[PDB]
Structure 1
Amino acid sequence: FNYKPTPWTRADALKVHSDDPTTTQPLVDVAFPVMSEEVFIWDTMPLRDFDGDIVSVNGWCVIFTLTADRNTNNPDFQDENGNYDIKRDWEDRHGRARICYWYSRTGKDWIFGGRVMAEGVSPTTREWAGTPILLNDEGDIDLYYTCVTPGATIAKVRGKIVTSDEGVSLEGFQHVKSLFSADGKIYQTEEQNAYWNFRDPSPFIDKNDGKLYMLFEGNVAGSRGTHEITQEDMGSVPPGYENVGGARYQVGCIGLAVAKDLSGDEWEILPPLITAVGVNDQTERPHFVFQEGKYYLFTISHKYTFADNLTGPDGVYGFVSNQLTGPYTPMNSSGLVLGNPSSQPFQTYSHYVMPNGLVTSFIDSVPWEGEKFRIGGTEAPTVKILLKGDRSFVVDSFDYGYIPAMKDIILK
């Protein structure tokens, strides 16, 4: 814990540029296909090992998704006229979230596998995002995820993957181990802020010290509205950009914890790697790419969680360091790595950067006819980026939901 968090400053955020074609997701076609007429998916968590390598098992690619039923024929989701209300159904998904798995030989055209956990296994009904880790070539998996309402608790659950020529089955995800919640000295609690953020574990091993760590989304500890914005949060802002309005209400951070040992059964919370006090309230789904001896730290954020007198698009932001604990500098100078285009600002969300440079996201809301929108709840086209020092470049795009493995694990 003998390091300082790196602020993502207001001065950095003032460089954020929407519609830079090197850092903008291609336009989603409003005629996109949907991967299921029975379920919505959104946050997508590819099966990975402790370095971030996407792994297939016996030639089967696997993804875990936040999932909810499409309530097409459910009277509870009809409007006053008795017509299915897709917008109300979709916007209610967070309260219905369950983790499901899908499989494919090809990394696309996903086959639905169903629930990871039987209903009742999760301490909370809501199963919010995290990371599935393939532990070994016997097929053992720890799904790290977030138990939400009551509270917000990082948890994990052990099970097994089994394969055949037909597909993949998950078994034995029966015992959820609660690992930790917000502490109130480093990370903000529900007591301090009814709207606190605490979620989205991403475990990794650092080969430099051999230890097991995890990233998560947090907020900087303190009673809502009381945070002091410091010069270090401001950065070198230009003349006329001193007015921060309500910026003390934006207190996002990328948290870090370290495990007592490689079992990951016991955790010590550490100071955050990145703080965004006075800049953005939500640094969601933090994740690493380890490339060319550097630590590329990515996080997803919203236009509407920026502080007053700052803005940027929905998308993935990022930072790079030579050392796990920093100091970090922002990717592309501003932090923006892949932003939605201004003509379709909500087209996708939950942009997840994999070490092969592929970026997956789910389709949210695309402009349709006049002032109307079409809802996705299905995978967006995969984008390829290159990382070159502290810059990134969009170079290609692929099919809807293309999430191939980087390597294949032969089960013993």
Structure 2
Amino acid sequence: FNYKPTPWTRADALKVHSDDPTTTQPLVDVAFPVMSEEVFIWDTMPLRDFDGDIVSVNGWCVIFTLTADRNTNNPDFQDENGNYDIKRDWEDRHGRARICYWYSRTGKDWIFGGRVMAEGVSPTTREWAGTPILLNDEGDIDLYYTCVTPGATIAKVRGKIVTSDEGVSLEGFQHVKSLFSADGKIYQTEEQNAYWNFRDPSPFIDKNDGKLYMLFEGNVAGSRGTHEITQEDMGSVPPGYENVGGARYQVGCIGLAVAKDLSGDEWEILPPLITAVGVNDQTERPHFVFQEGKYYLFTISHKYTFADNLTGPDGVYGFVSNQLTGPYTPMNSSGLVLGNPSSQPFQTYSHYVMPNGLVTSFIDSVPWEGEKFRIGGTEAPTVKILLKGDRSFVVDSFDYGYIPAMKDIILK
């Protein structure tokens, strides 16, 4: 606990630039293909090891997805004229979220595997995002995920992957351990704020101290509307930029916890690494890339969760430090790493930057015709970025849902 969070300040957010082609996702084809007519996917969680490397097993790449049925022929998802309401179906998906797995030898053209957990295993019906960790070369996996409604609880469930020449099976994801919820002194609770953010575990082992940590999305503790916007939250804003409007309502942070030992069954909540008080309510899906001795800390956020008199695109923001606990500097001087183009501002979401520079996202909403839009619920084209010191550059584009492994684990 002997470090201070690094604030992402109003001054930093004033540097955010939409449509910088070095930090903008290429336009999604409005005629994009869909990976499944039966299911929607969104948040995609590649199988990884404790350092962030994407791993295949016996040559099979694996992804875990937040997943819901498409209610195309479900009377309950017809409007008053009896027609399928894809918008209502898509916006309802959060309440229906389940974690499923897919597999592929190529890192694309994913084969559907089905549910990770049998219905009823998850303490909450909703299964929200986290990270699947391959623990060893015996195929043991810990899926860290979020249990939502009632409350918001980071949890884990341990199972096994089995492979053959024809595919992959997941087995034994039967026992969920609840790890922790918001505490109220460091991280905001439901009691303090009905709209509190607490989700998306991303565990890692730090070789500098050998300890098992996790990132997660939180908010800074305190009753909704009471937070002080400090000079450190402002940063060095220019003349005329002192009016923050209702910015005290935006209190996102990247939380950190440490495991009592490497089993990861017991956790100690620590101060956050990044705070965005007066800047953004949502620093979602925090994840590291460890490169050239540096800590690259990425988080996803929304245009519409910026505080008054700031703005930026939906997409991936990031920070870099030489030390786990900071100080951090914003990537590309503003924080923005990969934003949606302003002509298709909601085309993709849940950007996830992998250590190979590949960034996956799902297709959300693309402008279609007049005021119509197309809903995705399918993978977006993967983007490749280069990380160079405290800057990033878009340098290539790949197929829809291309998420190759960085190394292949041979099971024993």
The TM-score range, normalised by the shorter chain, is over 0.9
Q: Distance in 2 between matches of 1:290 and 1:186?
A: 26
| Correspondence for 2:121 | 121
Give deviations 1:302-329, integer Å, cap 9, x for gaps. Answer: 0000000000000000000000000000
Q: Deviations over 1:312-361 (max 9, x none)?
A: 00000000000000000000000000000000000000000000000000
The CA distance in 2 between the partners of 1:219 and 1:29, in whole Å, is 35
Count of aligned positions:
412
How far is 1:111 from its partner? 0.2
Q: How big is each residue's C-alpha offset from its partner over 1:206-255, in whole Å with a ceiling of 9 and x where there is no partner?
A: 00000000000000000000000000000000000000000000000000
Deviation at 1:11, TM superposition (A): 0.1
Following the alignment from structure 2 to structure 1, what is the Cα–Cα distance between the partners of residues 134 and 267? 19
Aligned to 1:257: 257
Q: What is the distance in 2 between the residues matched to 1:254 and 1:320? A: 13
2:228, 2:382 → 1: CA distance? 40
Matching residue of 1:325: 325
CA distance in 2, matches of 1:376, 1:343: 16
Displacement of 1:256: 0.1
Report the Cα distance in structure 2 between the residues aligned to 1:274 and 1:156, rounded to whole angstroms. 24
Residues 47-75 of structure 1 show CA distances to partners (whole Å, capped at 9, x for unaligned) of 00000000000000000000000000000
Q: With structure 2 as the length reference, what TM-score do the two structures score? A: 1.00
What SS is found at the alignment partner of 2:332?
Answer: coil
CA shift for structure 1 position 46: 0.1
Query: What is the SS of the residue equivalent to 1:332?
Result: helix
CA–CA distance in 1 between the matches of 2:365 and 2:280?
22
Shift of 1:198: 0.2
Q: Map residues 335-346 of structure 1 onto 2, 5 A cutoff.
A: 335-346=335-346
RMSD: 0.2
Superposed displacement of residue 178, structure 1: 0.2
Encode CA deviations 1:111-146: one digit per residue, 9 max, x unaligned. Answer: 000000000000000000000000000000000000
> How big is the shift at 1:295?
0.1
Distance 1:197 1:368 in 2: 32
CA distance in 2, matches of 1:276, 1:304: 14
CA distance in 2, matches of 1:35, 1:411: 29
Distance in 1 between the 2:368 and 2:305 partners? 25
Instruction: Report the counterpart of residue 143 of structure 1 in structure 2.
Output: 143
Q: Deviations over 1:284-315 (max 9, x none)?
A: 00000000000000000000000000000000
Q: CA deviation at 1:181?
A: 0.1
Q: For the residues of structure 2 that align with 1:62 and 1:173, how far apart are their CA atoms?
A: 16
Tell me how far apart the structure 2 counterparts of residues 376 and 171 of structure 1 sit (CA, whole Å): 30
**Cα shift at 1:203:** 0.1
Q: Does 1:311 align with 2:315?
A: no
- Distance in 1, matches of 2:350 and 2:184, equals 27
Structure 1 residue 93: deviation in Å? 0.3
- How much has 1:387 moved relative to structure 2? 0.2
Q: CA deviation at 1:4?
A: 0.3
Instruction: Give me the whole-angstrom Cα distance separating, in 2, the residues matched to 1:278 and 1:408.
Output: 43
Q: CA deviation at 1:199?
A: 0.2
Distance 1:158 1:385 in 2: 33
TM-score (normalizing by structure 1): 1.00
What displacement does 1:2 show?
A: 0.1
Cα distance in structure 2, aligned partners of 1:67 and 1:387: 31
Distance (whole Å) between structure 2 residues aligned to residue 233 and residue 26 of structure 1: 32
**2:227 & 2:369 partners in 1: Cα distance?**
43
Mapping of residues 8-407 of structure 1, within 5 Å: 8-407=8-407
Q: Distance in 2 between matches of 1:181 and 1:87?
A: 32
What displacement does 1:409 show? 0.2
SS of structure 2 residue aligned to 1:232:
helix
The C-alpha deviation readout for 1:270-295, integer Å capped at 9, x for no partner, is 00000000000000000000000000
Structure 1: gaps (5+ residues)? none
Secondary structure of the 2:333 match is coil
Could you list the structure 1 runs, at least 4 aligned residues long, displaced by more than 3 angstroms after superposition: none
Shift of 1:7: 0.2
CA distance in 2, matches of 1:211, 1:143: 19
